[PDB]
DNA sequence: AATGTGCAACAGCATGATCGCGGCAAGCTGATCGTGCAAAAGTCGTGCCAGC
RNA sequence: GCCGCG
DNA sequence: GCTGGCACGACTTTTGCACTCGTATATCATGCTGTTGCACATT
């Protein structure tokens, strides 16, 4: 069986461990991703102009 | 009131079945000092000195 | 259990591996929250609530 | 002579801290409403024929 | 959760 | 003639339905990572 989440969610397995896989894949500190993942701050994409 | 007093008297850290082998084990269990308990310390959290 | 009051401790002086002995005072109430006063090896007072 | 870079010290957090066995109580405690309507399903009081 | 056994 | 299990027209019960408001600590021992402070080479 399975559950459709209707909203993307993060895997605590990879987000929260001392060598954070997603954190160093993004080349950005864990605190920024933790803050953006809990709606404390936004993150922008593209916006070259 | 009744729930709190019964919960303490029946199901608590320091209210245990009294041993009944001989009168000696009874009398020993009655006058016992336990360092554990609610406001006390846990087994794994005690060092050599205690 | 520990009688409520004031207790000074020395942590045996092996915390920062510099040989500097750190003294900490602690106020334990019968019911409430404790107070800690601790020393930073740079010789700075510090207070710890709860 | 003022300046940018790489190295090191201090704080916070994750991890694990023996193996079997026996016995006794108490928690183990655990619920999302109604909604009001068709739509369906089921049920009940009643009448039916077939066996003795 | 507690107590004990080697 | 006497009796004892089968169907029918009202009544009665269930069910999707998906729709909103609504009290505590005190084990050390170790390793790893991140932030900040400081010595050294540079124009």
Method by which the coordinates were obtained: cryo-EM
DSSP B25-42: HHHHHHS---S-SSSS--
Tallying the residues shown for chain C, one arrives at: 50
The end-to-end CA distance of chain B, in Å, is 36
Q: Are strands C24-28 and C5-9 parallel, antiparallel or unpaired?
A: antiparallel
Q: Which residues are within 8 A (CB) of A26 and not within 5 positions of it... i.e. 6 or more apart?
A: A33
The closest alpha carbon to B12, from B39, B44, B43, B45, belongs to: B39
**CA–C1' span, A1 to F12, in Å?**
39
| Eight-class DSSP state of C15 | S
In b/e form, how buried is each residue of B4-36, taking b as 16+ CB within 10 angstroms? eeeeeeeeeeeeeeeeeeeeeeeeeeeeeeeee
Nucleotides on strand D with an atom closer than 7 A to protein CB? 10-11, 14-15, 23-27
Q: Does B39 touch chain C (CB under 8 A)?
A: yes
B41 CB below 7 A from strand E atoms:
no
B47 CB below 7 A from strand D atoms:
no
The closest alpha carbon to B35, from B45, B23, B22, B20, belongs to: B45
Q: Give me the residue label for tokens 């080349």.
A: A27
Quick one: CA dihedral A2, A5, A6, A12, positive or negative? Answer: negative
C23 vs C12: CA distance, rounded Å: 9
Write out chain C residues lying below 8 Å of B35, CB-based: 1
- Reduced to 3 states (helix: H, G, I; strand: E, B; else coil), residue B45 is coil
Alpha-carbon Rg for chain B in angstroms: 14
Q: Resolution in angstroms for this experimental structure?
A: 3.4
Nucleotides on strand F with an atom closer than 7 A to protein CB? 24-28, 31-35
- Reduced to 3 states (helix: H, G, I; strand: E, B; else coil), residue B48 is coil
C8 vs C36: CA distance, rounded Å: 10
């Amino acid at each position: 069986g399975h559950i459709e989440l209707a909203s993307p969610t993060a895997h605590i397995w990879f987000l929260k461990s001392l060598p954070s896989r997603i954190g160093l894949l993004l080349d950005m500190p864990l605190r920024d991703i933790e803050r953006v993942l809990y709606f404390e701050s936004y993150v922008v994409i593209e916006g070259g102009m | 009131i009744s729930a709190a007093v019964k919960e303490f008297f029946g199901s608590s850290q320091l209210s245990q079945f009294m041993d009944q082998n001989n009168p000696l084990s009874e009398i020993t269990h009655k006058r016992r000092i336990s360092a554990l308990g609610p406001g006390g310390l846990t087994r794994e959290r005690a060092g050599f000195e205690v | 259990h520990r009688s409520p009051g004031v207790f000074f401790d020395s942590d045996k002086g092996k915390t920062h591996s510099s040989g500097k002995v750190l003294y900490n005072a602690r106020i334990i109430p019968y019911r409430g929250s404790w107070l800690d006063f601790e020393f930073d090896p740079k010789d700075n007072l510090f207070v710890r609530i709860d």
